[PDB]
Amino acid sequence: DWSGSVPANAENGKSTGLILKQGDTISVVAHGWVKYGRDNVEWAAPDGPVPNNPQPSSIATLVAKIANKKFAIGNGVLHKTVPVDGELILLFNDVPGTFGDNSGEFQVEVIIESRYSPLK
User: Fold this and answer.
1) Left (φ > 0), alpha (ψ -120 to 50) or beta: where does 48 sit?
2) CB within 10 Å: which end of the chain, N or C, has fewer?
3) What is 1-120's CATH number?
4) Which residues are annotated as a binding site?
5) Domain ranges of the chain
């Protein structure tokens, strides 16, 4: 449903144009490598920093923003139920005000697996 790049230096994240509703289900996979600083060690996968330089929880990981709330994605998720309405924004969750020294981008694929419709 959407594929593209999520830049590590985009403090506001990357809009996908996918408008999610409560009860939809989605899958995401994320590839590649970014820098969250200039030092040779400051590399991250979507799952987060390489663990020879750990950061606080969820910091410098790939997250989804929906309705301005962050949800864990990391390297990916399969068939997860969306709990709030909103456009899916993808974000490298680095410390605000420090994105300017970042580089690289993740290659991300999103599939809307289902649109909410209950048995009735």
Assistant:
1) left
2) C
3) 2.60.120.430
4) 36, 42, 55, 94, 98, 101-102
5) 1-120
